[PDB]
Design a protein around this nucleic acid. Structure first.
Lengths: 86, 76, 164, 155, 181
RNA sequence: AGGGUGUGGCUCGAAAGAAGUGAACCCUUCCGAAGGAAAGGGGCGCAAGCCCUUAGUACGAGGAAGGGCGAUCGGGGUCACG
RNA sequence: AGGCAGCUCGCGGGGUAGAGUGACAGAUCGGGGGCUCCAGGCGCCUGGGGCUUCCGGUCUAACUCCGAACCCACGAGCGCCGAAGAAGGGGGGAGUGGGUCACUCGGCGUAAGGUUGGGUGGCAAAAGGGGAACAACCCAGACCUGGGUUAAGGCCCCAAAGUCCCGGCUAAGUGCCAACGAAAAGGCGUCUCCAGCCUUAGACAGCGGGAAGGUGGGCCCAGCAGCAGCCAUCCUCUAAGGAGUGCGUAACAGCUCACCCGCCGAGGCUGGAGGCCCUAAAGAUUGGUCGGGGCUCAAGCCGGGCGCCGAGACCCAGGAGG
RNA sequence: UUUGCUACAUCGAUGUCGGCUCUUCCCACCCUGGAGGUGCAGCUGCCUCCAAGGGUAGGGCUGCCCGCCCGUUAAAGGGGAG
C-alpha cells in the first residue's frame, strides 16, 4: 500500500531502481519522497505514483518529516543496509 | 505543501464573472509553476479552452487553517 | 416556401419603397401590447445570438402565442407590457417566373432572373440584438419566462432570455 | 534599439505573390536559407513588415555577427571584383578594402556595415525542434528579437 | 467534486463466521450460508478486520462512490439472511375460474387461469422453499436475490392474462416481506 | 499486366572490348568535403528527455600508396524475389 | 547615364465599412400636454379624427451634419539593377482574341462543380514529396551522378520513424476526415467552472404524532361541507398550524396542500453557461466500415511537451553545356 | 422515387414509351410475428415501438402510366437496378 513511511523503488527517471521513502501525500497523483543517504542521493521532490513500486518493508515517521528525522527511523529499524533484502 | 489559490478570467465569447463557480479554482502543489500547469490542463481539458483565452491574474498561497471549501481541507 | 430560403443574407438591404413597386402589407400590425407606464419590477428581454433574417410570418406568430399565454394567466391591461422592437424593413423577393413565365418558353430558366417582392423581413446585423421584452411585477416573473420560451420556438434565430 | 539586424529567408520562391517576390529581390533573398545583414532603420522596417510571412529577423550580437561573416565560401565572399571570394584570412582584406570601405585592414576590424547574400544550411536538430510550422504567425516566422542568434548557430 | 477519502464499517454480530479470500466473501450463520463474489469492485479495498468489515476508497467520483455504497448494502443483506430468513408472500386473485397451483421439484405449475388449458410453469432458484397455504404462497430462504427472483418468476408467468384484455385483476401478486423468520 | 532497376540461379562467350606489361577478389596504412555520434563522468526535470565534458573525437562521399592470390571480367539470353 | 517592381518621411486627393436621423429625402413603433369636430352616456365623462408641442424606439443599393483601416499623385532618402548583361530610337518574325479551379471582397439566384465582376495563386505550359487513388489543395521549381540536413506530412502492422511522457474526458466501435458526411429540440448521462438562497441557534430527504378548531361560517343551493357561478378574512395561541391544495365526490368523508414537535446528525436547494456522449439520425444502382487489419487508463477526443523519420527544396564533391 | 434549374460527359450514334419474361435489392411496415397505450367490458376499431424471414392474386375500361370500377382475399404496401 501507498501511505506515509512506505519504502518504494523508483521506476522511471535517472534514478531508476533506488530506495525511496514516502513522506507526504500531495494530491491525487503525486507524493513527496526523499532519499536520506543514497550513495548518489535520491533528492527531496515529488514523484508520480505511477513511477514507483512499493515494497513490503516500512518505517515509522511523521507526516512531512525532515530528511534528518527520516535517517533516524531507518537506523532504528536497522534498514540502512537492509534495503536490499528483496 | 503550500495550498495555492489561483484567480483569473477565462474566455468563452465575452465571459467574465469573478466569484466562485464559473471563474476561479484552488490548488495544492509545491511551487507556483506546478499549480499553473494544473489550471491550464484542467480548464483546457474539461471546457475546451486554449491557453490564449485563460488570463491568470492573482496567484498566492493561502493558510491551511482558513478555506471556505472543505474538499481541499480534507486531503491535507 | 421553407424558411431556410430567406434566413440567410443574399445581397444588400432592399428597403427603398420609392424604387420598389408593389410590396405586400406585413402581417404584424400591433407592436406594443399591455399597459406601458405601469409599475413593474422586472424587465426581462429576448436576445438573439446570431445574424440573420426573420420573416414577417415568424414575427407575427411569435407575438400571438406570447400574448395569448400572458393574457391566459391573469388579464390583458393588467401588469404586463409586451413589446416587439424590430420592424420588417427589408423586402424579400422570389424569382416566381419559374412558376408561370418559366414554362411559356417565356423568359424561362435563369434569363431575366431578378425577382419580384413577396414579403418583408427584419435584418439582424449585430450579435446580441433585442427582439422582444416584457415587463411584469415580482409575482409574475415565472409566467414571463415561459411566455418568452414559447415565443422563441417560432423564430429562426437562436436566442436567450435575460432578467433585469 | 540595436543598430544591426539579420534576416533569413525560410521559405522557397514557388507560388509567392507579385508584391512579395519583388521586395525580397531588393533585400537580396532570392531562394531559401540565405541571409543578409542590414542596419536597423525605419526604411528597412517597413520592408520586413511586408515580407514578414517569408522571413525571420532580429538583432545580432557579437556571437551571431562573428559567425555569419565566417561562413563564407568559394561563391560566397564579398564583392572582391564579384567572384564572392571566401575570406578565410586577412589576405583578401589587405587589398580589397582600398576601394569603398575604410578602417578595415584586419579580420578583427570588419564590424561596421555591409555584406552579400550569405548562403546558409537548414537548421540542425530540426527546424521543428520546438515548432511544427514556419507558416504560423510568430510560430516560426516574423520578428523574434535576440533569439535570432541561437537560430544562426544552428544553421 | 472528488471525495478525498471515504471509509465505512460493518459490524459482524455474534454467531456469524465471516470468511474472506481472493475477493470472495462467505458468511456462515444459523439459518444458512451465503457465498458472493466481489471481483467487479475495482478500486475498492475490502479489509477483513477481527470484528468488522472495512471498506475504503480514495478520490471517488460519482460512479466509484455509487459502487461502494451498493457493496455495503449487499453485505448487510448477507448478514441479515443468515440470522433471520427472508419470507415473501404472494396472493392468488381470481375472478370467475379458481386457480390451482402446485409445486413439483424445482418448478411451480399454475393451471386453470381465466379458463385456459395451458399450464404455466415458473423456475425455482437454488436454496429456496415454496409452499402453498391457501390464497397465499410463501417463499423462504437466506439469499435475498434467490428469494426475490423466485417470487418474481411466479409473478411473471401469470401476467399473460395481461394480453388482449382490459385488466380485471386476475393473477398472482406480491404481497409483503420480512417476517422475523 | 512490362519496361527500368537491386540481389541471386542456370546458360553463350572465336572475332570485333579490357587483360599475364596482370582480370577479378582479398588485407594494411594515409588524406578526407558537407555533416557528425555513443558508452563513461557530473548536473536539472514527476516523466518522455535535456545541459557540460567525452569531442568536432570515432566516423564520413571521394582520393593516394603499398602487400597477397593469381585468370577471368565487361557484354548477351532467360527465370525467381524486392 | 540613368531607371523603378518595394519601403520610409513630407505634402495632398477620396466618401467605402461604421455611425447618425432635431443635418437634407424617404420609411417606421409608442407615450404625455394643448386646440377642434363628430358619436355615446349623465356643464362633465368616454371613443375616433386632424394640427401643434415635448420624450423615447426601428431602418436605407439608388439618404449624409460625419467618417476609418486602405488605395493613389508628386519630391527627397533608402533599397536593388546599370557602362559585361545598357533609359530613349529604328528594324525582321510570330502566336494569342473558347480559359478553368482554390482562397478572398462582391451583383443575380432557394441553391449549384451555376452565371457575371475586383485582387492573389496554381493548372494550362510544372516534374518530384504529401492528401488512399486526385490537372486545380499543402511543400516545392527537376542540367547529370554520389553524400548530408530539412519542409508538408507522419511515427501499432501493411509502411521509413514513438505500442513516447504528463493532466483529463468518452462506453457509443462515437471516433480513427484541413479542403470531406447533419440542424432545431430533449437528457442532473457524466465531467467543470458564476450567481442566488437555506445550514450544529440542528438544513435537505425521510419517519410517528400534532396532522386541527367557531364553522362543515358562508351568497346561490335538498347539498359542492377549500377546489360547481363573485369574494372577504377574524383568535382558545405558543416548543403547534392557513378562513385551506390536487384528487374527488349528487353530497360527503378521507388522503394529500401549509406550519411545529420527536428522531437523525453533514452539508443542502434552485437558476446560468460550457466539454464529451446519447436520442433526434431512414435507401437501394449488387456485398462490411476510418484506405484495410484492428484499436477501449486507446491505436479515440481535449490542453501541453519531448525525440525521430521524411523531397529533385537548401548545403557539399565530381562532371556537362549556354 | 416527380417536376424544374445548370450545360460537366456522349453529335465519325450508349436503339427513345408501354407491356411480357426473368433476377435481385431498400424500408419510410399493407398482411403474417413480438410488446405497449386507449375515451381498451367482449367482438371490432384507432395509435406508438421492434422487425424486410415469407406473401402481396384474378378481371372490365384506356396504347398507356395514373385512375375509376367488378368478385374475392390474411393482405391484395410503396420504391431502386442507364
Amino acid at each position: 500500500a501507498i501511505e506515509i513511511g512506505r519504502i518504494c523503488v523508483k521506476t522511471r527517471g535517472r534514478e531508476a531502481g533506488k530506495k525511496c521513502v514516502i513522506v507526504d501525500i500531495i494530491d491525487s497523483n503525486f507524493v513527496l519522497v526523499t532519499g536520506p543517504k543514497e550513495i548518489n542521493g535520491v533528492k527531496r521532490r515529488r514523484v508520480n505514483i505511477l513511477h514507483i513500486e512499493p515494497t513490503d518493508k516500512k518505517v515509522e515517521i511523521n507526516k512531512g518529516a525532515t530528511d534528518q528525522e527520516v535517517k533516524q527511523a531507518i537506523e532504528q529499524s536497522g534498514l540502512t543496509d537492509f534495503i536490499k533484502e528483496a | 505543501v503550500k495550498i495555492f489559490m489561483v484567480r483569473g478570467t477565462a474566455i468563452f465569447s465575452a465571459s467574465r464573472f469573478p466569484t466562485s463557480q464559473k471563474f476561479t479554482k484552488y490548488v495544492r502543489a509545491l511551487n507556483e509553476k506546478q499549480a499553473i500547469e494544473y489550471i491550464y490542463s484542467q480548464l483546457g481539458g474539461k471546457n475546451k479552452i486554449k491557453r490564449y483565452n485563460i488570463h491568470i491574474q492573482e496567484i498566492k498561497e493561502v493558510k491551511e487553517d482558513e478555506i471556505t471549501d472543505k474538499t481541499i481541507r480534507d486531503l491535507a | 416556401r421553407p424558411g431556410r430560403c430567406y434566413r440567410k443574407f443574399s445581397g444588400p438591404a432592399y428597403t427603398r419603397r420609392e424604387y420598389i413597386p408593389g410590396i405586400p402589407m406585413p402581417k404584424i400590425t400591433k407592436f406594443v401590447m399591455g399597459n406601458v407606464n405601469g409599475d413593474y419590477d422586472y424587465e426581462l428581454r429576448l436576445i438573439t445570438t446570431e445574424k440573420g433574417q426573420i420573416r414577417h410570418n415568424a414575427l407575427e406568430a411569435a407575438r400571438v402565442i406570447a400574448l395569448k399565454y400572458l393574457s391566459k394567466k391573469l388579464a390583458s391591461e393588467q401588469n404586463f407590457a409586451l413589446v416587439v422592437t424590430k420592424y420588417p424593413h427589408h423586402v424579400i423577393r422570389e424569382n416566381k417566373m419559374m412558376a408561370f413565365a418559366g414554362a411559356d418558353r417565356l423568359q424561362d430558366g435563369m434569363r431575366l432572373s431578378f425577382g419580384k417582392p413577396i414579403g418583408t423581413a427584419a435584418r439582424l446585423e449585430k450579435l446580441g440584438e433585442l427582439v422582444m421584452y416584457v415587463r411584469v411585477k415580482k409575482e409574475h416573473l415565472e409566467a414571463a419566462k415561459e411566455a418568452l420560451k414559447i415565443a422563441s420556438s417560432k423564430l429562426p434565430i437562436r436566442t436567450k432570455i435575460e432578467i433585469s | 534599439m540595436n543598430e544591426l539586424i539579420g534576416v533569413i529567408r525560410i521559405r522557397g520562391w514557388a507560388a509567392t505573390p507579385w508584391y512579395i517576390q519583388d521586395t525580397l529581390s531588393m533585400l537580396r533573398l532570392k531562394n531559401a536559407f540565405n541571409a543578409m545583414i542590414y542596419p536597423k532603420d525605419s526604411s528597412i522596417q517597413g520592408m520586413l513588415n511586408l515580407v514578414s510571412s517569408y522571413v525571420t529577423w532580429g538583432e545580432l550580437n557579437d556571437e551571431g555577427l562573428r559567425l555569419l561573416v565566417s561562413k563564407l565560401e568559394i561563391s560566397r565572399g564579398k564583392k572582391v571584383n564579384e567572384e564572392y571570394v571566401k575570406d578565410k584570412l586577412n589576405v583578401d582584406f589587405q587589398s580589397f578594402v582600398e576601394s569603398i570601405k575604410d578602417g578595415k585592414l584586419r579580420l578583427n576590424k570588419l564590424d561596421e556595415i555591409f555584406s552579400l547574400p550569405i548562403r546558409l544550411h537548414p537548421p540542425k536538430g530540426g527546424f521543428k525542434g520546438k515548432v511544427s510550422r514556419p507558416f504560423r504567425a510568430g510560430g516560426e516566422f516574423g520578428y523574434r528579437g535576440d533569439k535570432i542568434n541561437e537560430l544562426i548557430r544552428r544553421m | 467534486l472528488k471525495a478525498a477519502y471515504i471509509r465505512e464499517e460493518i459490524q459482524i454480530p455474534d454467531k456469524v463466521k465471516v470468511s474472506l479470500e481472493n475477493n470472495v466473501l462467505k458468511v456462515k450463520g444459523p439459518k444458512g450460508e451465503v457465498i458472493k463474489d466481489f471481483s467487479y469492485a475495482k478500486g475498492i479495498r475490502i479489509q477483513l478486520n477481527e470484528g468488522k468489515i472495512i471498506l475504503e476508497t480514495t478520490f471517488a467520483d460519482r460512479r466509484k462512490k455509487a459502487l461502494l455504497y451498493s457493496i455495503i448494502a449487499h453485505i448487510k443483506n448477507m448478514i441479515t439472511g443468515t440470522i433471520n430468513g427472508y419470507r415473501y408472500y404472494l396472493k392468488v386473485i381470481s375472478t370467475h375460474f379458481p386457480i390451482s397451483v402446485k409445486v413439483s421439484g424445482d418448478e411451480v405449475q399454475v393451471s386453470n387461469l381465466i379458463g385456459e388449458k395451458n399450464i404455466r410453469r415458473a423456475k425455482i432458484l437454488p436454496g429456496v422453499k415454496v409452499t402453498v397455504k391457501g390464497e397465499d404462497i410463501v417463499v423462504e430462504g437466506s439469499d435475498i436475490y434467490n428469494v426475490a427472483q423466485t417470487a418474481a418468476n411466479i409473478e411473471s408467468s401469470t401476467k399473460i392474462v395481461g394480453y388482449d384484455r382490459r385488466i380485471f385483476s386476475d393473477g398472482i401478486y406480491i404481497y409483503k416481506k420480512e417476517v422475523i423468520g
